[PDB]
Amino acid sequence: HTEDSLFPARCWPDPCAGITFQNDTYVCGDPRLGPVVLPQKFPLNNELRTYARFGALCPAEFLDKWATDVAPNGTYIYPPANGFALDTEEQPILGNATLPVGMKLDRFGSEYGTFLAPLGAPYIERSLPPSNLNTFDGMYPYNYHVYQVTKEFVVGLGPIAPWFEQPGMGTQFVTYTNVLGLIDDGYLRRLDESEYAAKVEYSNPYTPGPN
Amino acid sequence: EDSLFPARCWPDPCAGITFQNDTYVCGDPRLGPVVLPQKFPLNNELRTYARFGALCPAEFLDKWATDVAPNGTYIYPPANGFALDTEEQPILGNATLPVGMKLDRFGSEYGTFLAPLGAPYIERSLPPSNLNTFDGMYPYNYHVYQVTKEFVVGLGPIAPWFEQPGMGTQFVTYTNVLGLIDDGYLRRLDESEYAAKVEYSNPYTPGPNQ
Ligand SMILES: *[C@@H]1O[C@H](CO[C@@H]2O[C@@H](C)[C@@H](O)[C@@H](O)[C@@H]2O)[C@@H](O[C@@H]2O[C@H](CO)[C@@H](O[C@@H]3O[C@H](CO[C@H]4O[C@H](CO)[C@@H](O)[C@H](O)[C@@H]4O)[C@@H](O)[C@H](O)[C@@H]3O)[C@H](O)[C@H]2NC(C)=O)[C@H](O)[C@H]1NC(C)=O
Ligand SMILES: *[C@@H]1O[C@H](CO[C@@H]2O[C@@H](C)[C@@H](O)[C@@H](O)[C@@H]2O)[C@@H](O[C@@H]2O[C@H](CO)[C@@H](O[C@@H]3O[C@H](CO)[C@@H](O)[C@H](O)[C@@H]3O)[C@H](O)[C@H]2NC(C)=O)[C@H](O)[C@H]1NC(C)=O
Ligand SMILES: *[C@@H]1O[C@H](CO)[C@@H](O[C@@H]2O[C@H](CO)[C@@H](O)[C@H](O)[C@H]2NC(C)=O)[C@H](O)[C@H]1NC(C)=O
Ligand SMILES: *[C@@H]1O[C@H](CO[C@@H]2O[C@@H](C)[C@@H](O)[C@@H](O)[C@@H]2O)[C@@H](O)[C@H](O)[C@H]1NC(C)=O
Ligand SMILES: *[C@@H]1O[C@H](CO[C@@H]2O[C@@H](C)[C@@H](O)[C@@H](O)[C@@H]2O)[C@@H](O)[C@H](O)[C@H]1NC(C)=O
Ligand SMILES: *[C@@H]1O[C@H](CO)[C@@H](O)[C@H](O)[C@H]1NC(C)=O
């Protein structure tokens, strides 16, 4: 049976073939391939439980498919229409929607970005490349950030197209102000780890019931 | 500390619930099974699941069902549970599912609602009773499928309901699962076909043109 591992078994004896080794923090020494050390604690370990980082590809095959160059100057190519899933007419599926006070969001990336997901979404639902897992600030291992909506605001809301050898099909929220702006104007607050450690903190007390 | 009921619900968490059957929490099948899955991937999909949110059982049924009494039935969201935009219209479109895509579902094959394989239970906005085992061959009412021929579904984000945040994606098929299988559009997957991490990745979507 298939055992889980960093590389597909086919990639040995030299899975890093064609990859310029730069820094041993990263897989094959290449920051585009994400960090060697993966999270061992909740919720990150839950979010990465289904993550085969290269799918069935080897590292250079993965870069050749999803980036402009296997060499270090290659950059990842991103999907059209901001990565929203496309309908049968090749039009993105989304709508402007209001996020309610209390809603918890998370993100792999700096606070200059504009793309978030609902708290706890699996990594493979986000169609993100391996390098979004790289640590840039020691206060935020894996560049993972969690926020809670403190004042209602409108975002582009819709399903995530598959990309980077993953199925996608989470939901993404594309904001019209970066995360820093939303924090400064009182739309989001940062949650620390103790505010998303318990199961009940993932449930929804803010949506009212019918009648 | 995680637990079945919130701490405030003791010493009588099942107050107001008529006990019917000890397979279910408080003996009520509407509140889901006592024994939760211990195997991958159901355990991964339920790791963030607080079954009642911060509510007690009777409060939960009072909010989401017509009656706390056993004749009460769950009330479901408008517009087939799609997230609504700022004009209260559901967000969705018709989309073609590609050959190789894996889907899963809690429910019988007379149903039409599916999600991407491995979506967390709280992303599905499903009540606790969708975890109830109805056929012993399918514990927890859980089914996995793989697209064997392209077909068009309604596709869109899931609105919050049932004290959960939603915001997974749902696929609403125009033919029930039985007819999709009979016509060669879906195939049933054994648990051995979704046991390894690589079986959750995507070999079917082509890369960008360069
Ligand atoms: C507590 O509730 C469970 C579940 O019952 C269902 O849900 C409740 C809420 C009510 O709506 C019921 O009407 C529902 O049926 C009961 O479990 C059932 O118990 C009966 C009696 O022991 C079982 O009947 C047996 O079934 C055998 C075959 O079972 C297998 O195949 C069937 C399909 O053919 C499948 O459904 C089942 O899961 C097995 O895989 C059969 O050989 C035998 O002769 C007899 O008919 C029935 O199978 C049970 N259902 C389930 C889903 O386990 C409990 O009995 C009930 N307890 C009490 C104390 O009331
Ligand atoms: C990654 O980098 C390589 C190497 O190029 C060098 O580094 C770049 C960052 C730039 O600073 C380049 O100026 C620098 O040379 C790129 O390869 C280069 O691509 C160009 C265009 O495809 C090639 O142009 C060629 O011209 C030569 C003659 O000089 C012809 O033989 C070719 O047929 C073609 O016309 C150039 O040869 C090539 N260099 C090498 C060593 O292969 C690469 O394009 C770049 N990748 C990306 C995505 O930018
Ligand atoms: C590999 O990359 C990391 C990250 O860029 C480098 O770590 C930095 O190290 C310096 C000290 O040398 C610190 O001041 C920085 O804060 C670190 N950045 C981090 C942790 O993100 C590391 O030095 C690099 N190693 C090699 C051999 O190039
Ligand atoms: C969503 O709305 C956009 C414009 O909205 C206006 O400007 C933004 C920045 C917010 O301030 C919003 O509250 C304002 O009403 C449109 O450009 C865009 O096309 C809309 N998208 C869809 C899918 O309708
Ligand atoms: C999606 O398309 C619907 C009609 O599609 C046709 O009929 C259904 C029953 C399926 O067999 C489908 O494959 C066919 O192409 C419309 O009724 C519906 O409004 C459409 N939804 C949109 C455009 O959002
Ligand atoms: C449940 O039964 C009680 C008693 O018969 C009744 O008063 C109540 O209206 C019923 N609820 C529903 C939703 O029918």
Residue numbers in the entry:
A (entry chain A): 23 to 233
B (entry chain B): 25 to 234
Lines from the paper:
These toxins invade cells and act as NAD glycohydrolases, cleaving NAD+ into Nam and ADPR and rapidly depleting the cellular NAD pool, ultimately leading to cell death. The catalytic part of the TNT is structurally highly similar to AfNADase. Intriguingly, the active site architecture of the bacterial and fungal enzymes is conserved, but their structural superimposition reveals the presence of a unique C-terminal calcium-binding motif in AfNADase, which is located at the edge of the dimerization interface. In the present study, we addressed the structural and functional role of calcium binding by introducing mutations in the C-terminus of AfNADase that precluded the binding of the metal ion.
In the first variant, we abolished calcium binding by mutating two critical residues for metal ion coordination into alanine (D219A/E220A), referred to here as AfNADaseD219A/E220A. The ASU contained two homodimers, which were lacking Ca2+ ions as expected. A closer inspection revealed that one dimer represented the native-like conformation, whereas the other had a conformation with an unfolded C-terminus. Superimposition of the dimers to AfNADase (C alpha) showed RMSD of 0.25 and 1.00 for chain AB (native-like) and chain CD (unfolded C-terminus), respectively. In dimer 2, the entire catalytic domain translocates ca. 2 Å away from the dimerization interface, also showing major rearrangements in the loop (156NTFDGMYPY164) containing residues Phe158 and Tyr164 8 that were earlier observed to be important for substrate binding.
